[PDB]
Design a protein around this ligand. Structure first.
Ligand code: HEM
Ligand code: HEM
Ligand SMILES: *Cc1c(COP(=O)(O)O)cnc(C)c1O
Ligand SMILES: *Cc1c(COP(=O)(O)O)cnc(C)c1O
Ligand code: NA
Ligand code: NA
Lengths: 487, 493
């Protein structure tokens, strides 16, 4: 076994010329008009000015986001996945149809699974239990095999994601662990490409770089290059509370060692992380990470993930010293796709304790002044439905059976349109026209609750615990109320 | 009210010089090094060669995918959202802080909500009930207000997405419906940009273009440009069963008018759709759409949506008429993000009948239907929750076990402890020998029955490390992925 935290034997030093590098460096390769496969859509990610969040928190400098979620697999890790595989192929390590096994928090796994799918490798991913089910869904669809490990397993225990990866490799002939924690291809991808894109996009002018840290390849690769090209650029590392990557060590004094944000922080120092090139660390927490991720979406239209939020949360503190004319770049590592049922969900945010209202929000449904609806039996014909709605002056009716079970809604307009198009005959029962989907809501529920319900259903049927329908309410009724009140 | 199917008053005809257009026309532009905002990340999408799928279905031509899911909002509609807003701003129609209301199947709503978030407009989306909750979650996060309409509401009834959009607008001052069904800004975005990109990318050489159809903006804009610049190019339109877009009308004969694929097909002919520039239509269905979308992911690594699947399902038939050296381009409209809990989920697919246990078990390994009991389980040592960390080390070592379920006096399973994690914890000073195991115990696990299959175990092991075998409450066994691997390897030796 080779431990993921063994001290690095890299003899790189700032001031040492590139000639002396024992490593293979891949230069930018002119992209053809037609990409031979999706793996060429990795790199050259956009750099986008942040327009509202910096100003809101009193930054004077320019704040720019390097948006790594536009890579083919949706994350920054697509760069290292591709580079680790290509170098291993060049080395003769990785032969056609071999098996790739990787311990990952998710994104390196997705990157590797995507390349494996394209290139024809068997791919086995080992991922802690805390990681999102959205990651599992994409991994499965890409044909990866998936093993999970307890989130709280110490990294050197047999059941850690690293321990289990090495134990699987030992049982599977022609398997390899490319090993993002030790493989130079990880930070070198960022040194050769990500860093050169940033310089190019900024015309070599950059005062601060803020990056969250997991393996440390991103911050290490970018920093080694920037210290060479742009030594005035301050390097700011972001580490979650619970992790021990940050220096000085006094920053890491808490009991808690778990957190909800995914992809950053560890219980060991990865070999590829060079902490000497980080000028200053900040600790982040889950609440600010998710607050800022939601802000990035809502104010900048940037559909990014949790650690992107961590990074920007730090950047608005760290770049406060910068002046107008100066420039801070942040790395946004992955996409909102990984977190659809996590921080993107208000219910989740509430459950986890991580979370303004219009004037009408706390009012109750009954204050709408509901009209008691006409109801019809499910045995009514399409023709008699038209006749009774028009005769009684209603445009719709709940269909309710003899036992009082609400079966759905019919409307005058849809019944007429269906008749006139020959979809139903006047003597048909209403089965082919009835709207079956609706949501019940109480007389005593809030209009806020109604508003939420109306994001999923057209019709809310008003009921009460104490068999009767008190009203049918749609979004137009709620608007009419709100508008009338304020006119 | 203006019906979204009124006959087009456009007098374009194939052969009329571009100098006769009365429209505003843009073109693809080089983008700046630093984007001023994310709305610049729209257009110039990749054209990617499809390497496995074409060959597998016998195609001789080159098959290329235009991947619109790389746009800022995740779809092709980001092009028309931006264009409709920019034109309405230049017009003087849309003023600072006005309200945008749009009837949408979801992607145009997302596009407009994204632009509205950036530029500061109130945005109200009106979306049929069938559209995914993933769309709702993105819309919500972008600050859009969301209203829904019955999926099988006829377009001309008051409760359709188009009818409800009109009724909302009438009650909200300073609101506008940009109206993708009638607004020239929709097909023009594709005529001016999408089509020109496709031609630049193909060096002006292609033989067939296959596109699925909803508003008709994509196919109409592309086809009008291609018919002018590449008149050999065959235009193939894809329409779901249940929709009336396709011609001849005989193709549209069907029992149902509902389907699960999102973003294509309608019960009316949108004003922006020019069907005269479509050479041939193919009817698609849900099963092939989702089969092909999953195949695009699994074989090409293209993280696309349902209608992308519809399009490729048709392309592998339509392009059979092409020979080696010809080229077919397909439009892939949106991303897998919208369908995470729909076609991406095997449970949803099974529930819907688009996946049948038969070919779900054809691809299955020999061990798949063996039972957990056939692993030959060892009775595990269990320990009480009052055991100390020190005594856990001792009893595991003494009795020869690497792990033990923690089980209270009443038989409740509290979790697992392991020798390795207990020792690492002790050596690192996280616990002391006399501590109880609360801080080291793994509380997460999944129960499985002796009579469950190894296929079921395999699924379980994609979510949990430990499966604890129980029966109707003694523990029969503890199983992990490594145990399953060892068993399969031993039987295959
Ligand atoms: C003048 C430039 C450089 C020199 C002279 C240098 C030198 C070395 C040497 C001697 C090794 C040890 C090989 C071995 O133990 O088998 C090594 C490993 C490594 N280098 Fe470099 N290196 C340079 C640049 C870089 C850069 C730019 C990066 C990353 C951005 C990097 C990352 C690594 C990593 C991750 C390893 C593996 C560490 C280990 O196994 O302990 N190096 N380097
Ligand atoms: C090249 C010569 C073209 C001419 C002479 C032409 C002409 C016209 C005219 C005169 C109208 C106004 C209808 C009215 O309100 O009276 C119109 C509307 C329109 N045009 Fe064009 N057009 C051209 C190209 C295009 C192209 C390339 C597209 C789409 C790619 C397009 C799509 C439309 C649409 C969607 C409308 C709105 C239709 C309506 O409201 O009924 N046109 N066009
Ligand atoms: C990997 C990752 C990071 C950190 O990048 P390293 O190069 O591993 O330090 C941050 N966020 C997410 C979501 C990641 O996957
Ligand atoms: C809009 C859309 C289509 C059809 O494009 P049109 O330009 O409206 O014909 C196909 N698929 C998806 C997912 C869409 O959003
Ligand atoms: Na993590
Ligand atoms: Na649809």
């Amino acid at each position: 076994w080779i431990r993921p935290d063994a001290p690095s034997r890299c003899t790189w030093q700032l001031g040492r010329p590139a000639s002396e590098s024992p490593h293979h460096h891949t230069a930018p390769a002119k992209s053809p008009k037609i990409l031979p496969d999706i793996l060429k859509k990795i790199g050259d990610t956009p750099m986008v000015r942040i327009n509202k969040i910096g100003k809101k928190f009193g930054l004077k400098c320019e704040l720019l986001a390097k948006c790594e979620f536009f890579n083919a697999g949706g994350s920054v890790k697509d760069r290292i996945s591709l580079r680790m595989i290509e170098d291993a192929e060049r080395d003769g390590t990785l032969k056609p149809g071999d098996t790739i096994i990787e311990p990952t928090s998710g994104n390196t796994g997705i990157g590797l699974a995507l390349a494996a799918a394209v290139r024809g490798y068997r791919c086995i991913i080992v991922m802690p239990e805390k990681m999102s089910s959205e990651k599992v869904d994409v991994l499965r669809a890409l044909g990866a095999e998936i093993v999970r490990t307890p989130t709280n397993a110490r990294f050197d225990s047999p059941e850690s994601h690293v321990g289990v990866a090495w134990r699987l490799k030992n049982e599977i002939p022609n398997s390899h662990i490319l090993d993002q924690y030790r493989n130079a291809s990880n930070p070198l991808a960022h040194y050769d490409t990500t860093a050169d894109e940033i310089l190019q996009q900024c015309d070599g002018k950059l005062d601060m770089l803020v990056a969250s840290v997991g393996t440390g390849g991103t911050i290490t690769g970018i920093a080694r290059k920037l210290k060479e090209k742009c030594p005035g650029c301050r390097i700011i590392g972001v580490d979650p509370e619970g992790s021990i990557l940050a220096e000085p060590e006094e920053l890491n004094q808490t009991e808690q060692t778990t957190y909800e944000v995914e992809g950053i922080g560890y219980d060991f120092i990865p070999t590829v992380l060079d902490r000497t090139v980080v000028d200053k660390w900040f600790k982040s927490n889950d609440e600010e990470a998710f607050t800022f991720a939601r802000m990035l979406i809502a104010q900048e239209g940037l559909l990014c993930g949790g650690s992107a939020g961590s990074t920007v949360a730090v950047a608005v503190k760290a770049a406060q010293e910068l002046q107008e004319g100066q420039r801070c770049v942040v790395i946004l590592p992955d996409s909102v796709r990984n977190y659809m049922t996590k921080f993107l969900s208000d219910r989740w945010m509430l459950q986890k304790g991580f979370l303004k209202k219009p004037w009408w929000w706390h009012l109750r449904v009954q204050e709408l002044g509901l009209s008691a609806p006409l109801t019809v039996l499910p045995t009514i014909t399409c023709g008699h439905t038209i006749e009774i709605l028009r005769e009684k002056g209603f445009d719709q009716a709940p269909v309710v059976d003899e036992a009082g079970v609400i079966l759905g809604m019919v409307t005058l307009g849809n019944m007429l349109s269906s008749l006139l198009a020959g979809k139903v005959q006047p003597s048909d029962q209403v089965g082919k026209v009835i709207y079956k989907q609706f949501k019940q809501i109480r007389l005593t529920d809030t209009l806020g609750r109604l508003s939420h319900i109306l994001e999923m259903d057209h019709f809310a049927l008003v009921v009460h615990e104490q068999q009767m329908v008190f009203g049918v309410v749609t979004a137009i009724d709620l608007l009419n109320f709100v508008a009338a009140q304020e006119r």
